[model samples]
Target: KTHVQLSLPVLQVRDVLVRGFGDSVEEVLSEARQHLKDGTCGLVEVEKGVLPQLEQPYVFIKRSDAAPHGHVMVELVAELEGIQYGRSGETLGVLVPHVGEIPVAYRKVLLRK
Candidate 1:
């Protein structure tokens, strides 16, 4: 017998980006928002300082312990005057993992797009 629960909500977003390294959730979010405004959108931990110039829009799922276990932070951004910036409004939602397939599903979805 198998039991599956669907209690979490799914958040779909476009032009997604991921940021990390903060003492708290608020700090991380603040930095991400600032990056959007400063046009410094790139992974901070990368060695070569590569920026993801994705041709198509993507859905980024950010996981943090500061957030509830099933919660997800979707970073949304927009392009204006040839510049990509974060949206004023942020999206937060819950994610329900299926049979330990969350990682697989996440990778597949990102690569698929």
Candidate 2:
């Protein structure tokens, strides 16, 4: 048998309850301040790689409830043809095929074990 190590999971878009980012620096600041009106989440970074033309950076926030949020099992599919899904825990395997390419998509899975 082989040994494997797990990489820390990152929060993906649509995984959390994102209140949405603001249009400008002022808007972002204002929106962040509003969260403090009662209780608030914090700043999050979003890469515009997959989906560009988005006005504000989409945030990957956790649910506003008291439940603990952890890794979300998400299964992904790409419609590029001739592409196979990556390893269950490795989302990059599918995209990192050769030297000319790098990991493109973040595909999560729902395992039943």
Candidate 3:
């Protein structure tokens, strides 16, 4: 056996629309805003690579409630594919690999855990 130190980065997204199937946008946004205010919001994921769009394929936003076993488990809302690099070789964004012409905007946030 070998001993090693582990350090990982976590991604936290803000101001992104998080909605469920057949759910009202207003209600969802309202809840998300409240969660954000309480610092319990933002989509979180453990990062393994630089390219989140490629490494983290699935998209699931964090919510205040609606998780079983008292854990932070949510439903899959969307999928992302392809990659867009920033000017400084950083990840800009990815394309929503689904039907329906839509536009999204947000900022990239990262935290170490």
Candidate 4:
């Protein structure tokens, strides 16, 4: 099974789909594709008993840990307008794998629209 650290309650994680981190982006994309076809995306939370709407939604990958050679670490993020409904207001970081350089700390994550 896959384990993900979610700050919010499971009941709060509705409407959106959770794709587990995999060896490659292709793996996650394949599973997420079905959810996307069904109009499911992002981890949405409802406040005041109403579903929260998002603007400029995006999914991103962050390099979680700095391991030694031949290792790669990354994280998947979902957010809109600089707010993360499902996650606590915290910024994990990203790193460039090939060169071990910090190109873009919080790079824009891309998903099929």
Candidate 5:
């Protein structure tokens, strides 16, 4: 099963971002919250919640370790005001995958093109 992680709870998310992600975003958030209970909302979406939400703009879905449990990569659709900088409370979506997360220590993650 692929693991799914919800940007909500761990960090505040705009309603539009949540809705835009997918119809199941809300439901999946709740389920993941209840099931995983991990300090970080990063988790896996149950198989049943995948297909229907694939096209959701906000959801950056991906497969889990086993290629079965589909995971989602949802981010806050924070409306930034300027190009050079972000406002005090604006949301920015940065995808910094954990390149090496194993062994004795997990390396720091950073953004990419």
Candidate 6:
């Protein structure tokens, strides 16, 4: 087993969310204010070592519904050729080999048990 840790200020998260997500400060403030009084609202930092124009997707979970939005902690690992399509590979029924130097795409698997 291996372990690693990462830490970043909440302010940094706010900034990242705002800039990366766009016009989110106003949205969040509105939501919190309403939730305290009434209720409203919805909403990553990634590094590319060698890949250029790396675009990563992210989602935010809030305490709006009494959920424990606990201390900010995130951990991840990825395989460039990872896949879960139709049980083994996708439409072609084949696994992709990491032959190219650049990562061209990433696919998300849904509805797999």
Off by over 4 Å in 6: 12-14, 21-56, 59-74, 77-113
Q: CA lDDT, every prediction?
A: 0.28, 0.29, 0.29, 0.32, 0.26, 0.22
Off by over 4 Å in 5: 1-23, 43-88, 92-113
Query: Could you give candidate 1's per-residue lDDT for residues 51-72 as a string of tens digits?
Result: 2432212222232213233423
For model 2, residues 62-89, the per-residue Cα lDDT tens digits are 2221211332332222211233222233
Indicate the worst ten consecutive residues by lDDT in candidate 2: 93-102
Candidate 2 segments exceeding 4 Å error: 1-11, 17-19, 42-113
Q: Which candidate is the best by TM-score?
A: 4
The candidate that wins on lDDT is 4
Q: Compose the digit string of candidate 3's lDDT tens values, residues 7-82.
A: 1122332322332212333444344334433444333332554234232333333232232332332222323344
Better of 3 and 5 by TM-score: 3
TM-score of candidate 4 on Cα atoms, chains taken together = 0.27
* Candidate closer to the true structure by lDDT (higher is better), 4 or 5: 4
TM-score of 2: 0.26
TM-score of each: 0.24, 0.26, 0.24, 0.27, 0.20, 0.17
Which is the better candidate, 1 or 5, if ranked by lDDT?
1
Inter-residue clash pairs, candidate 6: 34-39
For model 3, which pairs clash? none
- Across 1-113, the per-residue lDDT of candidate 6 in tens digits comes to 12222111222122222222222334433332332222111112232331122212222222121111232222222222242111222120111112122323332212110
lDDT of 4 by residue, 27-98 (tens): 444433443334332333234532232223333433455432332333445444465423322233211112
Q: What is the lDDT of residue 91 in candidate 6?
A: 29
Q: Select the stronger candidate by TM-score from 5 and 6.
A: 5
